[PDB]
Design a protein around this ligand. Structure first.
Ligand SMILES: [Co+2]
Length: 237
């Protein structure tokens, strides 16, 4: 198996699908996590971006992208999977965009030759998540590579139906069964994203409790698991 995961930001793949990535690697798959919006940024930053940087524990004008890339390498190394950091700027530093992302994805498909691509459903409708998903759908459709979408975490813990580009639809939900030790490995990887843990934990300091409770609702035997859907072509498309 050659598994190409396509993450919008530096954290999403691990948050949403870290157990699936680590179990695929343990099973013997060749796993590569490409993050689209890992592009380098520099001052001048917007006041909103400066605000994010300070929340994350950096100076307002620090190189937050480099710090986050190092978090991602640490997290993905803990899952024993490879990384690839793309050129696109996170929405806080910003069809044209989607086309460029799709072009880069097609190049990566040619180089890595995945047997399966997994990316986000873009539950929560974040523009970068939608751009990532849509670009991945277009590139994989053109290259005839199968695709699955993961349930975006923690965004789906509260809110599930998404509008895909015309021609694509989802099959039935699959909820994986993840062993307690692999749950722990995932959560340990999530913790490597120190910058993001600030807001992910929130005032109740409860990210992992929330993720556990969400999974317990639908996963086999009330254990841990991750929801994904296969993508197929709609009729008349
Ligand atoms: Co994200």
């Amino acid at each position: 198996t050659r598994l190409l995961a396509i993450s919008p930001h530096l954290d999403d793949a691990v948050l949403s699908f870290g157990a699936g990535l680590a179990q695929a690697a343990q099973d013997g798959a060749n796993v590569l996590v490409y993050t689209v919006f890992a592009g380098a940024a520099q001052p001048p930053y917007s006041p909103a971006a400066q605000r994010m940087h300070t929340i994350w524990g950096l100076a307002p004008d620090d190189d937050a992208v480099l710090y986050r890339r190092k978090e991602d390498i640490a997290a993905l190394d803990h899952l024993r999977v490879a990384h690839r950091h793309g050129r696109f700027l996170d929405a806080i530093y910003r069809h044209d965009l989607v086309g460029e992302v799709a072009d880069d994805i097609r190049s990566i498909i040619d180089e890595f030759d995945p047997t399966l691509v997994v990316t986000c459903a873009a539950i929560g409708e974040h523009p970068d998540h939608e751009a990532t998903r849509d670009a991945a759908l277009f590139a994989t459709h053109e290259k005839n590579v199968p695709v699955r979408l993961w349930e975006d975490l923690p965004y789906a813990v509260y809110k599930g139906a998404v509008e895909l580009p015309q021609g694509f639809r989802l099959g039935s939900a699959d909820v994986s069964s993840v062993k307690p030790e692999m749950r722990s490995q995932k959560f340990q990887a999530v913790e490597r994203y120190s910058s993001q843990m600030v807001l992910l934990n929130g005032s109740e300091n409860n990210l992992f409790d929330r993720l556990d409770e969400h999974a317990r609702q639908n996963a086999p035997h009330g254990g841990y698991g991750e929801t994904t859907w296969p993508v197929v072509r709609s009729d008349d498309s």
